[PDB]
């Protein structure tokens, strides 16, 4: 089960200045980037074109190329339309793609946020507001849904193009998506709290616990999964302990990469 995410972020400082930047993810691996400065979308993996033919990708990049320019003006105009209800600075985020399930099954989404709050989605054959959205959004929704051409296209992107594109991506990218990188571990203390540092593992699922032999130490607090630059993960676990008690304390790590032989460290 993989989720394909096209995340768009657009800022508008005033009536004239704006920028739009995008990133694309398949699971937790970046596949494309399209910065405001670039006329074209960049592949970040060799297999980022997926199983698309060159003509097909050109046709697709072009669509987006036009959308970026269209989107910018539309927002600026929608601001003109609502004013002085809203005003700059303005922040719009889109999240679009599909979640792929076994065999044939998939489910597409397109979610819009305004000033960091989720307010709009494409659903079915039209745009609609979600619970909590402010009523003024009804005029933009009414305006956006008037555009039959945009509707048909967005419908085509979500129902057809996305799942098809992603099935191809998963084939082309099998090597990377299924890669196994081993974690490396080290130990440290702070004025006493012990820290088991676990770094460099892929994929994300990992097990990390402090142990006195077979006894599993509660009070072990794992933090968040932090990313490295090389597309592996970093995680650490802290255990709270009394001063003069580190004797016999181990850190045990399990991961799919290690294949059975756990990492055991001692202080």
């Amino acid at each position: 089960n993989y989720t394909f995410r096209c995340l768009q972020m657009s800022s508008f400082a005033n009536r004239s200045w704006s920028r739009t930047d995008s990133v694309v993810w398949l699971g937790d691996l970046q596949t494309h980037r399209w910065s405001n400065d670039s006329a074209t979308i960049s592949f970040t993996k060799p297999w980022s074109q997926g199983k698309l033919s060159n003509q097909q990708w050109e046709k697709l990049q072009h669509m987006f190329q036009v959308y970026r320019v269209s989107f910018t003006r539309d927002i600026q105009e929608l601001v003109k339309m609502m004013s002085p209800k809203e005003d700059y600075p303005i922040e719009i985020q889109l999240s679009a793609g599909c979640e792929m399930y076994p065999g044939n099954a998939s489910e597409s989404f397109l979610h819009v946020a305004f000033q960091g709050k989720y307010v709009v989605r494409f659903w079915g054959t039209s745009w609609q507001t979600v619970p909590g959205a402010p009523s003024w959004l009804d005029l933009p929704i009414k305006v956006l849904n008037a555009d039959q051409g945009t509707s048909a296209t967005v419908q085509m992107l979500l129902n057809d193009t996305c799942p098809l594109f992603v099935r191809g991506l998963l084939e082309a990218g099998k090597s990377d998506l299924e890669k196994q990188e081993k974690p490396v571990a080290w130990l440290s203390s702070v004025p006493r709290q012990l820290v088991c540092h676990v770094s460099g593992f892929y994929p994300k699922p990992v097990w990390v616990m402090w142990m006195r032999g077979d006894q599993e130490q509660q009070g072990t607090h794992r933090g968040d999964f932090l990313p490295n630059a090389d597309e592996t993960w970093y995680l650490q676990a802290t255990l709270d302990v009394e001063a003069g008690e580190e004797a016999g304390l181990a850190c045990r790590v399990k991961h799919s990469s290690l294949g059975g032989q756990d990492i055991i460290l001692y202080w």
Partner: T-cell receptor
Amino acid sequence: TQVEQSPQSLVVRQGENCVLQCNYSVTPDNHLRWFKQDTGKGLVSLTVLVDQKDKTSNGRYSATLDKDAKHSTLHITATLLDDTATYICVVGDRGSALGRLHFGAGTQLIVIP
Amino acid sequence: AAVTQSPRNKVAVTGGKVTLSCNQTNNHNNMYWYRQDTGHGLRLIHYSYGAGSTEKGDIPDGYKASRPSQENFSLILELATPSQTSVYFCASGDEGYTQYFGPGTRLLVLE
């Protein structure tokens, strides 16, 4: 200028067919509409084409639109004196009121009765 | 669904104040002022998305716009110049892409 019309002007005899070109660089190109304008008067809409490769008619007027080529022609069949007018091309850049219309400078037709 | 302009025709002097009016009873939110000169297509001067709103178009200089109500949209020439001799068109519309045009207003500005 993003919308061009040809010929600039033309003289035909009553009963004769004519063809009017419109070429544009507008982006994106949601729709294209042909207006008829009598001298000294207003803009009567003849047809509006909307599809990638679209074809429309309206009595003696017919029209095509090819969006790949960004080209449209307006055929008048069996011209009458009243067809004497300026014919104007318009491309709209959205399918909503968020759009801007881009106007050709028109094609002037005279029909000799 | 129609639109009305007044006056239909106006002779004015340089330095004068000229007001061109547009009225629509379609309850359309959006209105638009264009000018037509031979050799150009209609060019957008000013527009409006509703009462109390006015927006610059492509060639706004020398013109003020005024939207006091859903019904009325005005084009104001504070200091008319010969170069504002033209035929002026008003239009209105709802959320759709169609713009419904008025009958046009001819203005001549003499020295």
